[PDB]
Design a protein around this nucleic acid. Structure first.
Lengths: 92, 247, 49, 57
RNA sequence: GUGAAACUAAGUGGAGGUCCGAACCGACUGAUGUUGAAGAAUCAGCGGAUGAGUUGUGGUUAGGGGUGAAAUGCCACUCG
RNA sequence: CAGGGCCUAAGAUCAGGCCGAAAGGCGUAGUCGAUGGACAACAGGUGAAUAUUCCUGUACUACCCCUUGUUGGUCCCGAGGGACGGAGGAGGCUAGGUUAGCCGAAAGAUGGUUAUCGGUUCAAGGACGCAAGGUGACCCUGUUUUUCAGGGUAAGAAGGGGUAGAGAAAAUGCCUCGAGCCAAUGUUCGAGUACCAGGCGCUACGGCGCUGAAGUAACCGAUGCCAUACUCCCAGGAAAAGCUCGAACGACCUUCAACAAAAGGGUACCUGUACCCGAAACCGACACAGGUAGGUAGGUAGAGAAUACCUAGGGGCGCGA
RNA sequence: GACCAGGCCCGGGCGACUGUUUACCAAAAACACAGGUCUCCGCAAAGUCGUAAGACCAUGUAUGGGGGCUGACGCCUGCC
């Protein structure tokens, strides 16, 4: 059997995007975009929940904790997909 | 050849002194790591020869030890006696002739011989007379005992079927190796001992007052109250194997 | 026949030579990370001190 | 020399091995201390650290 | 230099609980400071500074006790 | 990169086991426990707050797929190794420094003068390889034995290899082949359509935009490397895993399954990352003339990390007159 | 020529010496020391902590492990 490290309610593993101006800097400059996830999350569970719900090959998943408690995730997509054409569809 | 894979490695840490942590064997601490040497006291390979290749300094002992090989593939360490020619051959066994360096049970030998490593009963590793010059002689034997004069001026009839490594154990010249550097006592892991006059009455019974205090008590005592001169500390009925104390 | 054996032992000498020099240079890099003096940007900026 | 100051910059890992919740729950005495802490009403019955993260504030 | 010893120039060597002196450790004298800048320090010198050294980290001994190169010293500015 | 997914030291907890009014004490296997052992990334740029983490270049680890062989393989077990002291000084070099050469600019209202002012940079890694350094065994000849000139040995190095005993590996004993070996440093690629002095065009006058020369040699010389290299001494200098080798016994799975490689692609586990850290943010109740492990160690005069003045960088000590 | 950078000699008392000691009034002539001597201890040792199991001693074995006193070195250490 292929167990994950922790079973963590995968339709709630992502919470909200970040709409700061530096996030748009990461879109136009990095082909990346910014999500807010819960602390109980992975570079294997978030990375699977982007290539399925969105339909995009994700390059890397750079995560960090934020001292108010919640977790911040810079997800960088592949070169084949612009983050600007996939972020205006959501509302960025 | 150092790192023999016979130095045996893990020990209890240095010259320890902790039972529950309380100082219970006083004046200990300091020095090197002093990694011990697991030597072969009870020779479990009888009637096979073995040469002598190295006289290594054991820091745990007062004497030296030596590395002995075999005709088969093994390596041991034993206490080398006085007269260990390099390359000389030692062999344990029951009928092996007497040579300075080999071992044999206490029966098949004459009386009046220099032996260091003897056993007090069967099966043990090695107990008596194994210091840096400790030599035990034999007075004549008996039915199942053997009167043995061990190096205290003390005789003892003993079980006759005990292993014994015949020879006078070497490194005698530590009788005169002076510690005149005066802090070389601390290199052995031996802290300085304080004296009973210059302590307080809460610590030692000879805690004094003004000046160099005289000893005050009727007898010079230990720091736990027992008289420290002449009072024999020995249970009255243990063995009755010793013939005369002779001391 | 013997010179080919000397080339096989020489090839063992090259393989073990590259492995031992690789382990030695990586352990030197770890000895210089552990002291806190490895990266040449942090030394080249501190050439003046 | 230093001053007659007692607490210093010791790691909170070693302060949590001594005064933390594990050595406080490894004895009958320490869990009796937690009977008195929970019986009084203290919001912080130990002074600890965390092996993962620092503080959620 | 005698058949070998005993002993000595001369190099080589780098031992020391060696010497001078920085970091570092410690606190001998003096002045200041005494509602002090500081519940023990500043300034000028001072002792050790390859050792019986100093220090970090993780530990150990807990009060009819521990520990003490021994002062009733220290054990959270508290210790007969 | 630093810890955990690896390992153990001091020490702690200790299944069973012994003991003890209770609580618990002792103690073995086992398991935790870094201050240690093992393991793979450097340079330039970006940037109100992040950089070995983001972008670009070159890399390296650990598995899978793609091609050749093998029928056994993994673990436990047997072994090597990991694996270790202090002091000492001499070499071979790098890091830095100075000078010279080269390139660009310069008239700095003074008597003269360009003698002046700035650059002269590049890492990890991949390949090739080491001497006038150390090591390589014995004897004679020449020299201060020594650096070298010359002859002989069949073992006399780093290393491999056969056997013999209950002997797979190992260890021990015997025999044989090998004159070389070791490692910093080094040349090239990385590496220039980078960086850089300068000038060229606007200032929100805070900087951006285009173009761009030389980018070498020698003397010093490290407290850094070789280097756990040698010499000396006693006070004699951790452990386990990773790694490598291997028979029997023991547990499981077996053919397109397992194992070992050769190029080429794919994949990349959690926590810490700000800021202060010779301190106004830590510890001294203070924005306190005090304390706090470790790393980098520029110029001149000096033996020097003291001292005096200064480059970089940072301040003018939070009451003044 | 600045900063920096030994004052020395002649006697005596004590402690041989380098060190350690009362954090915050005493650094000493005090403690320790190398050395000496007495005394206990034959290993299921003595001694120490614990009602006990047991642990240090010690994975050491009288050239070793406790304990008392004195304190290098030189001459000795009398009588009861």
């Amino acid at each position: 059997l292929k167990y994950p490290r922790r079973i963590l309610d995968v339709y709630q593993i992502l919470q909200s995007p970040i709409i700061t101006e530096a996030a748009i800097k990461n879109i136009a400059d990095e082909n990346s975009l910014l999500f807010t996830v819960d602390v109980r999350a992975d570079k294997k569970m978030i990375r699977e929940a982007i290539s399925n719900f969105f339909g995009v090959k994700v390059r890397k998943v750079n995560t960090l904790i934020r001292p108010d408690g919640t977790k911040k995730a810079y997800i960088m997509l592949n070169k084949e997909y612009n983050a600007s054409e996939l972020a205006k569809k959501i509302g960025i | 050849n150092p790192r023999n894979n016979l130095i045996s490695g893990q020990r209890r840490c240095g010259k320890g002194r902790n039972a529950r942590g309380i100082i219970t064997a006083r004046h200990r601490g300091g020095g090197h790591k002093r990694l011990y040497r697991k030597i072969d006291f009870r020779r479990n390979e009888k009637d096979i020869y073995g040469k002598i290749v190295t006289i290594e300094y054991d820091p745990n002992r007062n004497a030296y030890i030596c590395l002995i090989h075999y005709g088969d593939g093994e390596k041991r360490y034993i206490l080398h006696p006085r007269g260990a020619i390099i390359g000389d051959t030692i062999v344990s066994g029951t009928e092996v002739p007497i040579k300075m360096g080999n071992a044999l049970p206490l029966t098949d030998m004459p009386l009046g011989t220099a032996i260091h490593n003897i056993e007090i009963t069967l099966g043990r590793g090695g107990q008596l007379a194994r210091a840096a010059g400790a030599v035990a002689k034999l007075i004549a034997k008996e039915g199942k005992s053997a009167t043995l004069k061990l190096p205290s001026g003390e005789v003892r009839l003993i079980s006759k079927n005990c292993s014994a490594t015949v020879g006078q154990v070497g490194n005698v010249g530590v009788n005169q190796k002076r510690l005149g550097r005066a802090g070389s006592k601390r290199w052995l892991g031996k802290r300085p001992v304080v004296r009973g006059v210059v302590m307080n009455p809460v610590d030692h019974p000879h805690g004094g007052g003004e000046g160099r205090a005289p000893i005050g008590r009727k007898s010079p005592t230990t720091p736990w109250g027992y008289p420290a001169l002449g009072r024999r500390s020995r249970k009255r009925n243990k063995y009755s194997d010793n013939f005369i104390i002779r001391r | 026949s013997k010179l080919q054996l000397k080339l096989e032992q020489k090839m063992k000498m090259k393989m073990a030579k590259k492995i031992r020099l690789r382990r030695n240079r990586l352990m030197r890099k770890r000895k210089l990370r552990k002291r806190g003096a490895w990266p040449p940007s942090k030394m080249k900026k501190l050439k003046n001190v | 020399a230093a001053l007659c100051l007692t607490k210093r910059s010791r790691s909170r890992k070693s302060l949590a091995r001594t005064h933390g919740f594990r050595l406080r729950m490894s004895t009958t005495s320490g869990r009796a201390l937690l009977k008195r802490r929970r019986a009084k009403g203290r919001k912080i019955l130990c002074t600890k650290t965390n092996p993962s993260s620092g503080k959620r504030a």
